[PDB]
Amino acid sequence: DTLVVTANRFEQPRSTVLAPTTVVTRQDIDRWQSTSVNDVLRRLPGVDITQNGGSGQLSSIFIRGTNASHVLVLIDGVRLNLAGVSGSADLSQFPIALVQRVEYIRGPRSAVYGSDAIGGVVNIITTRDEPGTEISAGWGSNSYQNYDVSTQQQLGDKTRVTLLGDYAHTHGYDVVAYGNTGTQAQTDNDGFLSKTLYGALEHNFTDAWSGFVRGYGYDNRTNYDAYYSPGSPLLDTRKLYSQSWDAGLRYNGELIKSQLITSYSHSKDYNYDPHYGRYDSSATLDEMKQYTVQWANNVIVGHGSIGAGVDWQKQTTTPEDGYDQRNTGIYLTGLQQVGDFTFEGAARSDDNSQFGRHGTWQTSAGWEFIEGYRFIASYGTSYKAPNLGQLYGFYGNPNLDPEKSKQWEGAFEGLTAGVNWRISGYRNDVSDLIDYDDHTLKYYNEGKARIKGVEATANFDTGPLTHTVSYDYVDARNAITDTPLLRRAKQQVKYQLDWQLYDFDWGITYQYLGTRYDKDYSSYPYQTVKMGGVSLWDLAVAYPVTSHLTVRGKIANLFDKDYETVYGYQTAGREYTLSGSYTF
Ligand code: CNC
Ligand SMILES: CCCCCCCCOCCOCCOCCOCCO
Numbered sequence: 093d094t095l096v097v098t099a100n101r102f103e104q105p106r107s108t109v110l111a112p113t114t115v116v117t118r119q120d121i122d123r124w125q126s127t128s129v130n131d132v133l134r135r136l137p138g139v140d141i142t143q144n145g146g147s148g149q150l151s152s153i154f155i156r157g158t159n160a161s162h163v164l165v166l167i168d169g170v171r172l173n174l175a176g177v178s179g180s181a182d183l184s185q186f187p188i189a190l191v192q193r194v195e196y197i198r199g200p201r202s203a204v205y206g207s208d209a210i211g212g213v214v215n216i217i218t219t220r221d222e223p224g225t226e227i228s229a230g231w232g233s234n235s236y237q238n239y240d241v242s243t244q245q246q247l248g249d250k251t252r253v254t255l256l257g258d259y260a261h262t263h264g265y266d267v268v269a270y271g272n273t274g275t276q277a278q279t280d281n282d283g284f285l286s287k288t289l290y291g292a293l294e295h296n297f298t299d300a301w302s303g304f305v306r307g308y309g310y311d312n313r314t315n316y317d318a319y320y321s322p323g324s325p326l327l328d329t330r331k332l333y334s335q336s337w338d339a340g341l342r343y344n345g346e347l348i349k350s351q352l353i354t355s356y357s358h359s360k361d362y363n364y365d366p367h368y369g370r371y372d373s374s375a376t377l378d379e380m381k382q383y384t385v386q387w388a389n390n391v392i393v394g395h396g397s398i399g400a401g402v403d404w405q406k407q408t409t410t411p412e413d414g415y416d417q418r419n420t421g422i423y424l425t426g427l428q429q430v431g432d433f434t435f436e437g438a439a440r441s442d443d444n445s446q447f448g449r450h451g452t453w454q455t456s457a458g459w460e461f462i463e464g465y466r467f468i469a470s471y472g473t474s475y476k477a478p479n480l481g482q483l484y485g486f487y488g489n490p491n492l493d494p495e496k497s498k499q500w501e502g503a504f505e506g507l508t509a510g511v512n513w514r515i516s517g518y519r520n521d522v523s524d525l526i527d528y529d530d531h532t533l534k535y536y537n538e539g540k541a542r543i544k545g546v547e548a549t550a551n552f553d554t555g556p557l558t559h560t561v562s563y564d565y566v567d568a569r570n571a572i573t574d575t576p577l578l579r580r581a582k583q584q585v586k587y588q589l590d591w592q593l594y595d596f597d598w599g600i601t602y603q604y605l606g607t608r609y610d611k612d613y614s615s616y617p618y619q620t621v622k623m624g625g626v627s628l629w630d631l632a633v634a635y636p637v638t639s640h641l642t643v644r645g646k647i648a649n650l651f652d653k654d655y656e657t658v659y660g661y662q663t664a665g666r667e668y669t670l671s672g673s674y675t676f
């Protein structure tokens with residue numbers, strides 16, 4: 093196991109987390125030769141992603157079949173900051189260079205974190221420890237190119253620093269669109285450019301008390317497609333800027349853990365064509381500022397812990413009505429162990445300045461009935477806050493309540509003859525779904541979803557061969573009308589194969605994207621169409637040409653499989669990348 097700290101906010105061992113958690117490390121990501129967050133995520137259990145194309149294009153994540161806004165994305169413990177009016181975050185913009193570790197725990201977790209923890213939680217962590225300085229970059233399949241410098245160091249004792257800058261660029265391909273340009277097209281590759289900057293300070297006043305400060309930021313330009321009058325502007329292009337800063341102290345004692353954290357984030361997300369735009373306009377800007385403050389405690393008691401915090405949010409976006417919004421929550425957590433029984437739980441009330449008070453809880457009990465074998469049940473209750481669009485839009489309704497989930501899940505987990513496996517069943521009923529009525533050009537909370545999913549995983553070695561495999565089946569329907577929701581695969585299958593030989597470290601990663609259902613905007617009324625669903629393979633190698641130098645190479649979409657995760661957006665297709673790192 094591996095500590096991981098994103099279940100109850102403090103360190104703890106995964107074994108000791110009844111819910112399915114998955115962790116991705118740097119080694120991992122470097123292996124994977126991943127070039128985006130999207131890449132990494134798509135691999136793990138329960139994740140369905142979709143893309144209005146290649147790199148840089150919006151994207152969307154469906155954890156166990158919930159809506160794309162029904163996931164909580166945390167960066168370093170802290171809600172992302174998706175600006176605009178749809179929960180949807182789209183980690184297509186979030187520089188992968190920043191990523192040192194992802195920690196991902198599927199299932200509800202609003203009783204710790206609040207809103208969005210409905211499917212599960214994706215905590216992306218920017219923080220390393222792993223001193224030295226590093227150069228690198230790469231080249232490839234669409235004049236893609238990347239360069240990058242890293243270091244962390246000490247400035248005398250109890251202090252260390254960390255800087256990173258990183259530049260990627262690609263020209264891309266046209267992604268056609270097809271029901272989003274109207275009269276004409278693009279016949280234009282729609283590229284992406286991001287440039288990024290990170291700094292850290294890290295400091296112990298002692299071997300218990302510590303602090304940080306961080307600051308980071310990026311500056312992306314990506315090009316997209318739109319709709320079109322001959323006219324009459326486009327909106328070709330998007331330009332996002334985004335900075336964050338944090339501060340905390342921690343104290344980590346033998347029994348009692350504490351943290352006080354702080355952070356402030358501000359983006360500014362221009363869309364525009366492209367000629368006299370800006371600035372025009374003809375030119376939409378969405379800006380946001382989120383502030384955050386949180387203080388938490390835990391301590392050790394039994395083979396258990398108890399913990400609690402308070403946790404405060406302020407988001408002022410800019411335009412007369414939707415602008416400044418505030419949340420505050422207070423929760424409790426508990427772990428314990430008794431015999432071969434674990435019990436783990438959490439609860440929270442939130443007070444939200446639009447919709448007032450709402451609360452939320454979860455439980456799990458496990459039973460290790462034979463050594464190595466273990467049976468877990470869980471129950472849990474989560475929610476999602478209304479968005480401005482829904483609230484204060486043109487069909488806004490500022491009285492909306494949140495959207496409510498209930499989830500049950502059942503799992504067996506075992507070691508058997510060398511294989512670490514798990515399998516797991518869940519029902520999630522969602523409700524008070526926010527659903528506009530043509531009806532009256534207002535939204536209301538009215539709609540219901542059911543989800544029934546199964547998650548099976550395994551890992552093992554045979555040779556010098558390593559196997560990491562999962563299967564996922566998600567049956568996600570509209571409860572009222574009993575049709576399949578959209579853009580979701582009933583079925584996924586993901587294998588990875590790792591091994592080492594001569595000095596070539598090899599990986600081959602397979603996935604099957606099962607078939608799915610969506611909308612063809614080609615023509616109103618708009619109809620749904622069934623996408624067929626498909627098999628990908630990528631091939632990756634690395635070599636330590638020295639001792640400081642690794643040199644890698646990756647063929648992605650190894651055969652050449654055409655397909656979409658969104659009807660009308662062309663996906664990538666076969667790409668090469670050729671890449672290098674020096675250390676010292
Ligand atoms: C719906 C829609 C669509 N939209 Co909007 C349009 N036009 N639009 C919206 C509206 C949805 C409101 C609602 N859905 O009830 C609406 C009015 C909010 C709008 C919003 C915006 N629109 C935007 C854009 C970019 C586009 N939109 C598309 C997603 C363009 C879509 C093109 C497409 N995908 O076919 C789209 C035409 C169809 C998506 C769909 O229905 N998904 C079905 C659902 C199951 O999938 P999903 O993943 O849950 O979809 C969600 C999101 O995609 C999201 N969303 C909507 N547009 C965006 C844009 C951004 C950047 C983000 C992060 C999310 C979104 O809302 C969804 C559901 O609540 C887009 C691919 C069309 C186009 N050719 O560019 C495109 C993005 C290009 C790119 N790759 O970055 C805006 C920047 C428009 C503008 N300049 O104001 C903007 C941002 C919203 C925000 N909060 O930041
Ligand atoms: C000191 C508070 C610890 C529990 C806080 C969260 C409890 C939320 O519901 C828990 C009760 O539901 C089932 C009871 O059985 C186990 C309770 O939690 C044990 C947590 O370690």
Ligand SMILES: CCCCCCCCOCCOCCOCCOCCO
Nearest residue numbers: 423424437438439440451452453454473
């Ligand atoms: C710290 C532990 C938190 C325990 C919370 C779980 C129990 C929640 O209580 C019941 C859930 O629904 C609440 C209302 O119950 C019946 C309502 O009857 C009157 C309706 O207006």
Ligand SMILES: CCCCCCCCOCCOCCOCCOCCO
Nearest residue numbers: 400422423424439440441450451452453
């Ligand atoms: C130390 C903080 C304790 C936080 C626990 C709050 C958890 C949420 O409450 C239980 C879940 O929701 C049940 C409450 O819902 C009923 C609301 O009732 C309030 C007064 O009737």
Ligand SMILES: CCCCCCCCOCCOCCOCCOCCO
Nearest residue numbers: 462465466467503504505506507508509
């Ligand atoms: C749903 C989970 C079903 C789990 C059943 C596991 C039952 C027993 O499995 C392993 C028990 O050990 C027998 C296997 O081999 C014994 C190896 O022991 C080495 C020397 O005795």
Ligand SMILES: CCCCCCCCOCCOCCOCCOCCO
Nearest residue numbers: 502503504515516517518519544545546
């Ligand atoms: C304890 C793990 C459950 C394992 C799933 C495979 C065996 C299923 O047996 C009967 C099939 O169930 C039909 C429903 O399948 C999806 C339901 O999933 C969870 C909904 O409660």
Ligand SMILES: CCCCCCCCOCCOCCOCCOCCO
Nearest residue numbers: 513514515546548549550561562563565
């Ligand atoms: C899956 C029921 C058998 C007991 C668990 C076996 C451990 C799973 O390891 C293999 C997982 O990889 C794919 C599993 O596919 C099996 C379940 O799919 C059945 C869907 O109801």
Ligand SMILES: [Ca+2]
Nearest residue numbers: 278280282316
């Ligand atoms: Ca374009």
Ligand SMILES: [Ca+2]
Nearest residue numbers: 447448492493
């Ligand atoms: Ca209310």
Ligand SMILES: [Ca+2]
Nearest residue numbers: 460462463464
């Ligand atoms: Ca044991």
